[PDB]
Design a protein around this ligand. Structure first.
Ligand SMILES: CN(Cc1cc(C2CC2)on1)C(=O)c1cc(N=[N+]=[N-])cc(-c2ccc3c(c2)CCO3)c1
Ligand SMILES: CN(Cc1cc(C2CC2)on1)C(=O)c1cc(N=[N+]=[N-])cc(-c2ccc3c(c2)CCO3)c1
Ligand SMILES: CN(Cc1cc(C2CC2)on1)C(=O)c1cc(N=[N+]=[N-])cc(-c2ccc3c(c2)CCO3)c1
Ligand SMILES: [Cl-]
Lengths: 657, 536, 656
């Protein structure tokens, strides 16, 4: 395989902390205690004899109405991926019934309402009962196995009941993020051809009202196939209701029994459609492979144990909510959080009040949330307990070291593992991530592939695989995995052309990646944490702090590069405040400012004054881009479609060259 | 003080089959104790797997409860009621009589084999599939007491359709109301009925009702009499001509245990009692076997109507599930004369008889010359269903129909319990005239003071009858009105099932059913007696 | 009398042994496991056949059939009961509690074992366009079409009409219906617009699968043009899926008509299988011809019958390459191109050309190119090639062949010996097969490794078939050898047709009522002194009316449809204008002239054609009979030879 045999120790690696060593009374990790223990198990899941491992894990992890015989078949070329094809199962049975039969009063969902005082625990019994009522309502509307049902719901716990009610009867749910405009909701409702929509009267988030039902009425004026709308009374405030079409959730459910049989679904029966954010692409996922993928990743990537309380702060309208709020945790039979507020409502301490109130054991959030909390100050977090946490997760954009260390220092008090996850709607479940009890982390690196994932780097100019470490190119996967998306709804040609045609024989993620000298994977390039100039270890944060002391400086970002004289050299990008008016003199003046603070050896090799730093629409400084420009790769920077002002990159290249 | 011990015909003597449970109260209590309490899953799991044939085995025995009405039994299992009432007995002995069809005119009677019943059932099922009937669709049935009514019931069950039987004596308005409630698109009925020498204009009433039932698209009409009736082109087709085009076999739909089997509306806003498949079928099969001590060659005669729950459970589902012979009696107790019941018993050698106290009192007041000179020795067990039988009728039943040689079985149950809830097991329990005696397997009943809400422990107590735990054949909801289901049976005495009937235990623990409970309004957490307010 | 088990015996009308002689052709070395060829499944003599066959009928046959069902097919749910029902009411059941899928057994399970193995040898009309279609490719195309059909709302139990020529996608269309539980109804792609309309309307399908054009023998078949003509009288059809076989310009109706490749390109290349009960209908196949009879076949029993016959009658082995040169529009293509061979997981041929295009060497070029191991064709093809000369075959290799099959009609000695001498070079077994659409699979045939053959004899019944001969005048079975009568079967067999679609009464009256207790094949048969079975051919008189060959029986069939007619008899006679003219003699029932004659003629024109309308229709008291219509007499009376039992005198009076 392209993976290392061992990873030598260094000061750039953060080894699993004691809470991930089975110390201090915490559970012993599922995989541990070192890199070798990861690669030993991973090797069983790919290559020649991997069928045996997947067959056993499939039968151990999920309950089946009918056993499977074949483990896998098909491939990328024609998009006929199959996993466990002869088997039958039901996603609601595996996420609800089987746990309800074992421990009905166990909490399935921690519902943290927008207002803290309205939060409560929802048991597996209560969740199963509401799921069965809604399922029965859908059947009364004529919903059949294979019918699409659109869901336009905010982050209330009943959204899980809506998802699983569709899965329970074999319907295909299509969740629409509850912040979407009427046009985006319309486009998704029409493409899936649903006749039924499940929505709410209003949403509540950050103390503000979301006029879901008003937006629905506007969209449905251009959705002629929709005949039934089920409306949850989230707020009870007055909203328009169309006679016949619109019915109240509580009034319909009260008419129905609180149990409903499960439809026996084929492994490859479609479980849901999820349209990409933005003609949108309906990503289609099967039942068995997707369910197994989410169950195994949650268990192993977050080291989940039977009594854990998992807090994913995402939205069910996106794939992260599908896989790591609803399906992954409930399949494992643990407690999962549905978080309805924002990270700063009522104050920026909300996340941490939440963790300490429920004693959450894992937290899964996005760098954009961490960036918001970083701006609000340390006082909102530093005096909390938070010791119930063992694993801190990050998902979304590539995370920069400064945010990583803030997350590590304050959310984890340096006692949690940071699992940086890479995946896509189309992968179904986490694709590259450290196993927190085995893998030593680097700030900004996803590390090593998950079970079933055999990834490699391809030179896009030649199409050939790059062998060895310290290589960089585009990321591809060599073989199908259980939770891979199976098609694009009614547009299979687009599925093949987008993912399978660019590099025949491979799955094309669409992202650039680098594999560093130790074999660690870096999505969209390597980012610098600490740079070693002439034997001095200097953190980008240390240098940037010295630069900002100059009152004229607004923002700064420093990156490193190999240097024939000092080993590695520091390159600093600096933007001045509007209240400032020679360029060379300022650069010399800034270097002295660094020398006075840190030392005569810490002066950056180059200081570039630029109008603005390159950022994405989320505000993330693109330090990886800057690193490549310094390395001379300004003509190999990638699509760069995420940037806010794409001219800034061109300005940076001119200054550097 | 009367106490009648199991008589010789129920002691394994005179070549009669030995009773399944016997010989005394201790033999009943020994088995019953296995069916209630915290360790009863073993017994029920075993009885479910031995009594019924399953396509898919179950894992969970029971779950859910009264509070929210999420009662589950054998949830992961699949089965088919038509397979268990027809196919499996056809495969064993196709020529065995499934139905003794006693027509309104005695000379038009005949035996209907399992083979004939299965083939007609299959033909009808194929017709329903050609009409577009799918698993889960409701089908209304408006049929009189001819043997094809069973084929109609079991045709719906065979394909997973939900049949809704409407008593063939109902008015157009009552039939209209029940057809529209279930929203069925297909109706099965007859051109005419015949009962007591008089013609029942079923099709004329149907045409009146369907002018106000816009959802009905297909009507299947049996030629019971062949007399001229109005037929609507397209909508109405003849049963025999439709079945003549269809094959004589039809595959069975694999049904989940909790899939609805049928809706039965209350006698009368009609209330649709819904029963699922496995639990109901198991309950009717076990009660018939044990309450009536039914053995493979027995000939069971329930003199009820398939339009009521008694006919659902103890003409069709219970007896046919056991593979024995069941009776479809199309006449009255006194046509052509008041000897009709007793002519029937001797002509077919009925082994058990299940009738209503009203018919017994009727025949008692017609004189004993109509019964006293019959044979009737084929009988072993005489059952009574309905209001509790008054002692005077009990003794007439015992003296003349049984000749003091049969066990008398008074039964207590309701449409909502699915199967017999309290009754003496004929080979074990010494009976008291007018007493239901002791609860059936899976039934754990108690008496509560209607005011305090508390259990009256001990004996010589009287109050409201309640059940502590769900049983397999309990009704699962009221069709599209689950809130009425909870409010009627589950909210009056939280934690229990409220039968709605008064009851008393005597010094020996025998139960005595004491008529309907004085309606008690619950005014914002206060239970009020309508009788006390009237007093004030 | 053969022992089936220790102490158990079966009493059958078949011999116990067949003595050797020089008129019998014993299995040749290629069928003796010599020269590296596979050892036969049943062998080496008659005794080995009767020993196994006796287990499949008679006392303990349930055990044998249960094991073969579980060995031959993959089941989602096992069965409990082996067989039930019977002829009287048409409630035949086999393996009723079991569930399976025909597409899973013909595709998925073989694709999972060896995806690159060739499923179909597609011999295109033009040789240069022939190629091998793997199980992978076939499964992918089957799943795409299945997904397309589901998008049209096709559900389990819905009929789907198929009007496809002999391109390999025809198998994908068949199996796509089987995969989702739909009932396919294949219509021979040579049928007229009227014949297609009648079958599309009777099965009430809402979906039709066809092609833009067909290609056969260098000629184009305007399938889509014929479809457009037929669908103007097919109101239930809403979706037509059109395969681009040629890509040349054809009409397309917006909305109704969609291209196969464009629809399939939108769909995934995998599709789950519907779990089907053994007795769920698999397909409708309409008999060739007034009112067509839709023969319905179930799933499990039919599939097992085709699987076992293909394996044992042709001694197929895992890597064999089976070449059935029939058409998928007929039962022989259903059973021995698609279902039988693919169920066995072997390679099967889809032959799109004729036996003489581009030359009469096509069959033999085919065998030598693909190394075909068995060949299955019709006596009309063998006779045709025989007339084209020996040079086209005598210098080919053909040594890959082991078994040569014949189906369709009695094979005559000249054809049998030509087939044996040149196609087989006297080194193949000749298997002469008898069966019908209604039997599902071969009913009487020699097992090639056990039975010594006689040219023209089907020989002995297949597994599960217990057949006998009945005197049609008495209804009683004829005991012993050297007997002649009508062929009947004594008990149901797994692949027997279960009904006639929406006409079960016609099913019972046609097959189960004529000889109660038996299945009536409708064919004459004889058992010779050695016990070998010989099937009698059908009789057909053909007259030449205005250059068209017209059968007398067809006209009689059209005339008798009028329920007032009791009997009818049509004869031909010289006519100065049409060459020969049609003269119909008609007798009416007691439950009944100018208008009747005109009405009967119109009915004949509608069914057969305006050229078949009788020139004269004679209403007579009774047709002249002996014991058998005297058609010779009627011809002479019409021709004016009345100068060469009283009804005959009236007939002459009526005619003149
Ligand atoms: C980041 N995204 C999208 C996503 C996910 C992915 C990967 C392919 C899967 O790719 N994109 C998430 O689903 C999300 C997961 C978690 C927390 C948040 C969040 C919560 C509150 C909050 C902010 C973010 C900004 C301030 O308040 C979001
Ligand atoms: C008694 N009932 C109702 C019932 C049943 C129940 C049980 C709680 C479920 O509760 N109520 C029956 O179904 C019945 C069963 C049997 C015979 C008869 C009958 C027949 C002819 C006849 C008379 C009675 C009066 C004179 O003519 C009726
Ligand atoms: C013989 N038939 C009909 C049939 C079959 C049956 C049996 C009841 C099932 O009953 N009838 C076939 O399907 C057929 C099978 C094979 C080859 C041919 C063929 C091909 C080309 C060709 C000719 C014949 C004449 C010259 O060109 C035909
Ligand atoms: Cl395995």
């Amino acid at each position: 395989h392209p993976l290392p045999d061992s990873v030598p120790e260094s000061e750039d690696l953060f080894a699993p902390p004691p809470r991930m060593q089975g110390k201090e009374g915490r559970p012993k990790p599922h995989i541990g205690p070192n890199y070798e223990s990861y690669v030993k198990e991973w090797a069983k899941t790919v290559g020649p004899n991997s069928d045996e491992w997947w067959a056993a894990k499939a039968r151990e992890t999920l309950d089946w109405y009918d056993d499977f015989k074949t483990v896998r078949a098909g491939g990328f070329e024609h998009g006929d991926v199959q996993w466990f094809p002869e088997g039958t199962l039901n996603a609601a049975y595996n996420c609800l019934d089987r746990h309800y039969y074992k421990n009905p009063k166990k909490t399935a969902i921690i519902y943290e309402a927008d207002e803290p005082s309205e939060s409560r625990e929802v048991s597996y019994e209560e969740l199963m009962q509401e799921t069965c009522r809604v399922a029965n309502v859908l059947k009364s509307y004529g919903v059949k196995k294979g019918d699409a049902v659109s869901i336009y719901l905010p982050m209330t716990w009943q959204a899980a009941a809506a998802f699983l009610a569709c899965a329970r009867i074999g319907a295909i749910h299509s969740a629409v993020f509850a912040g979407f405009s009427a046009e985006s909701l319309r486009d998704r409702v029409n493409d899936c051809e649903c006749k039924v929509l499940i929505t709410t009267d209003e949403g509540r988030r950050g103390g503000k009202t979301i006029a879901t039902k008003q937006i629905v009425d506007a969209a449905l004026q251009q959705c002629p196939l929709v005949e039934n709308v089920l409306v949850l009374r989230r707020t009870g405030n007055k909203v328009p209701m169309t006679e016949g079409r619109d019915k109240w959730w509580d009034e319909e459910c009260a008419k129905m029994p609180a149990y409903c049989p499960c439809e026996r679904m084929a492994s490859e029966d479609p479980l849901f459609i999820l349209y990409t954010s933005g003609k949108p692409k309906g990503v289609v996922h099967s039942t068995a492979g997707y369910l197994l993928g989410t169950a195994l990743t949650l268990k192993y990537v977050f080291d989940a144990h039977p009594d854990d309380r998992f807090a994913c702060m995402a939205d069910i309208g996106w794939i992260t909510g599908h896989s790591y709020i609803i399906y992954g945790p409930l399949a494992n039979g643990i407690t999962t959080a549905v978080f309805e507020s924002t990270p700063v409502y009522p104050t920026p301490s909300r996340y941490w009040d939440f963790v300490d109130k429920w004693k959450a054991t894992q937290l899964y959030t996005a760098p954009t949330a961490i960036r918001l909390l970083r701006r609000m100050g340390e006082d909102h977090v530093k005096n909390h307990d938070l010791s119930s946490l063992r694993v801190l997760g990050s998902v979304g954009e590539p995370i920069n070291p400064e945010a990583w260390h803030w997350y590590n220092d304050f959310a984890g008090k340096n006692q949690c593992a940071i699992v940086d996850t890479y995946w896509m709607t189309e992968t179904g479940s986490i694709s590259i991530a450290p196993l927190p009890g085995a893998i030593s982390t680097k700030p900004g690196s996803a590390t090593f592939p998950f079970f079933g994932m055999d990834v490699d780097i391809i030179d896009p100019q030649t199409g050939q695989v790059l062998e060895g470490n310290d290589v960089e190119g585009v990321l591809v996967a060599r073989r199908p995995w259980p939770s891979i998306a199976r098609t694009v709804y009614r547009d299979h040609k687009r599925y093949l052309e987008t993912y399978m045609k660019p590099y025949p024989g491979y799955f094309f993620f669409g992202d650039g990646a680098a594999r560093d000298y130790d074999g660690y994977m870096w999505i969209k390039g390597r980012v610098d944490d600490v740079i070693n100039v002439s034997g001095h270890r200097l953190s980008t944060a240390e240098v940037e702090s010295a630069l900002i002391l100059h009152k004229g400086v607004a923002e700064t970002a420093v990156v490193g590069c190999a240097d024939d004289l000092t080993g590695q050299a520091v390159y600093a990008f600096v933007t001045m405040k509007p209240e400032f008016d020679k360029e060379a003199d300022l650069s010399k003046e800034l270097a002295i400012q660094v020398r006075k603070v840190i030392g005569p050896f810490a002066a950056p090799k180059k200081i570039y004054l630029v109008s603005d730093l390159p950022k994405t629409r989320s505000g993330k400084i693109m330090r990886r881009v800057l690193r490549k420009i310094v390395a001379g790769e300004g003509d190999q920077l990638g699509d760069l479609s995420s940037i806010a002002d794409p001219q800034i990159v061109e300005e940076v290249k001119q200054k550097v060259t």
